[PDB]
Each structure stands twice: as C-alpha cells, then as structure tokens.
Structure 1
Amino acid sequence: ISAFLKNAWAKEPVLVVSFSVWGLAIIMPMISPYTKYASMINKATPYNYPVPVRDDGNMPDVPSHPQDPLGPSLDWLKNL
C-alpha cells in the first residue's frame, strides 16, 4: 500500500492532509496529558455566586473564611 499512499500524496495531496488531520484530531485528545484539565478550568470559573451553606456543627470539610486551607484550591492553575 506504500505506492497508493504516496501516489495519492503525489497527485491529490489535499485529500491526504484532510484524512491525516482528521485522524490526528480524533487521536490527540486521548494521548494528551492536559485533556483532563479542559474540564477543570471550566469548573473554576465562578459565573454564579457561591451560595453559602448553614452550619449545624457537622460541616467540617467546607471552609469558614474564604482564605482558609481546608477547601478547594486553584493552586494547580497558577502552575499549569
């Protein structure tokens, strides 16, 4: 098939680049290491106010003050 692949490359290159990049865009997301970071960045953007939640003495893992170390953090975004 080597001749056919390069014969088309020699005569109709446009239909080989289209097929090549078509397969490249399909496969690249699976191999990239940053593919999972596309979702997290779109979870960071706070378009709506973060509604607070009452305390009943049984809500330990959520922070009290905004700038406290016991909540979700974006320190991985600053260093991406």
Structure 2
Amino acid sequence: SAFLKNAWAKEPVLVVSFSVWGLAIIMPMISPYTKYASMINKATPYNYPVPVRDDGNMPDVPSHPQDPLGPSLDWLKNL
C-alpha cells in the first residue's frame, strides 16, 4: 500500500496505466449494456433476408413484414 502511495506520486503513469487496463477488463464483465453490443450489431441488417417457403404452421411473418410476428428491435428503440 505504501509504495502504492508513492507510486501514485512517483511514476504516476504506470499506476494510471494499469488501473485502466483493469477497469477495461472489468466494466465489460459487469454492465447492464454489454449484452446489447452483440445484439445491436447482430440486428443491423446488411445482407438481404431471404424468405422461406410457407409449407405451413409457421410463426414466420407472412406477407407484409409489418405483421406482429417475428423479431423486434424495440429494445434498440428506446434503448
């Protein structure tokens, strides 16, 4: 601890340096948003969504995509 103190006052870059190294190694683990990144980026539609044949008995949005069925990004909205 004592060195820590002087280290905070002498060579006070490394201290800050390491501190950040860690804080970046922790925040991701504990955060209410970390999960969104893999979703928000997952959702972003880049490649055309090819439609499947309607053999039947499916929950897939038929016709207008506006159908209430399917995935939603209201989580992205009001995020």
Q: Structure 1 length as normaliser, TM-score?
A: 0.90
Structure 1 residues 66, 45: CA separation in 2 closer, same or farther (over 3 Å shift)? same
Is residue 63–residue 71 contact of structure 1 (8 Å, CA) maintained in 2?
Answer: no
Q: Deviations over 1:8-44 (max 9, x none)?
A: 1111000100010001000110111100000000111
* 1:36 alignment partner, SS class: helix
- Please tell me the root mean square deviation across aligned C-alpha atoms, in Å: 1.2
% identical aligned pairs: 100
Q: Structure 2 length as normaliser, TM-score?
A: 0.91
The number of aligned residues is 79
Gaps of 5+ in 2: none
Deviation at 1:57, TM superposition (A): 1.4
Deviation at 1:61, TM superposition (A): 4.1
Gaps of 5+ in 1: none
Q: Deviations over 1:22-80 (max 9, x none)?
A: 01000110111100000000111111110000011132344432001111011111111
Is residue 59–residue 70 contact of structure 2 (8 Å, CA) maintained in 1?
Answer: no
* 1:30 alignment partner, SS class: coil
Is residue 8–residue 16 contact of structure 1 (8 Å, CA) maintained in 2?
Answer: yes
